[model samples]
Target: NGIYASSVVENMPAKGKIEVGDKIISADGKNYQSAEKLIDYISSKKAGDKVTLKIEREEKEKRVTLTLKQFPDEPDRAGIGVSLEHHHHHH
Candidate 1:
């Protein structure tokens, strides 16, 4: 399991660097098994904190750094402003 950007909000730190359909391999050099865990790590940080993300898009991997922002609904919460989703596969 992995985290991915289902949507990136405009006017946010993730707007330029990350995109929809991109698989987030790691954040701040840590791998999370789910989107919720990734969000939990980010939420633990504060606004203005810089986070580096390892992501894959179009089968290509890249690194991007984004500054955390205050969540719109909860100003005290810190986030990267992206909607995240994870896929589960069964074999």
Candidate 2:
């Protein structure tokens, strides 16, 4: 699904608030013109950061919150169920 998210991952924070086939429209009530902008905003946040998201779900607008997860910078990888080629940004 790449960043389009073919499915939701459990045990993190994005679960439940997001469902399959939904497209995220914004964060913090602000529209992001591109994925690049969204990634930049998300990157500035830390693990456990709470983000309010606006998404187009089922042909309607909806708001959801996601708590960011800490990508372990120590280990190169972790146990996985689903896979996401998430963007990693450098400061």
Candidate 3:
């Protein structure tokens, strides 16, 4: 499974450093290697938990630090709203 960008809904945690379609790379510098594992790491964290993210978008690379927060609409989930591909699948 690939760790596609999850969503970008103007949420505070992900707004400044990330955008739609940014691929998640690593957490705390080591590659977690799985989307769920990376998400799980964030889910297990508390609000304001300090985090460093390795990410890429359109072949661009960058790192971002954020204070983890619960997704406002999705309970118990990290609120780093990442979005998948810019467009939906087409035939």
TM-score to native of every candidate shown: 0.61, 0.54, 0.57
Which of the numbered candidates is closest to the native, going by highest lDDT?
A: 1
lDDT by residue (26-49, candidate 1, tens digit) is 777887777778766765676767
Best-to-worst ranking by lDDT: 1, 3, 2
Model 2 Cα shift for residue 35 (angstroms): 0.9
**Best candidate, TM-score-wise?**
1
Worst 10 residues of 3 by lDDT: 7-16
Order the candidates by TM-score, highest first — what do you get? 1, 3, 2
Residue pairs with backbone atoms closer than 3 Å in model 2 (clashes): none
Error of 3 at 17 (Å): 2.8
lDDT of 3 by residue, 1-91 (tens): 2367655556455554664666767767767767767666665675756777777767877765667666677776554435567688774
Predicted structure 2, TM vs. truth: 0.54
Instruction: State model 1's lDDT.
Output: 0.64
Candidate 3: C-alpha RMSD to true structure equals: 6.5
Question: What is the lDDT of every predicted structure here?
Answer: 0.64, 0.58, 0.63
Per-residue lDDT of model 2, residues 58-82, tens digit only: 5877655566565455234433333
Show model 3 residue runs off by greater than 4 Å: 13-15, 72-91
Q: Which residue pairs overlap in candidate 3's backbone? A: 5-83, 6-82, 6-83, 7-81, 7-82, 7-83
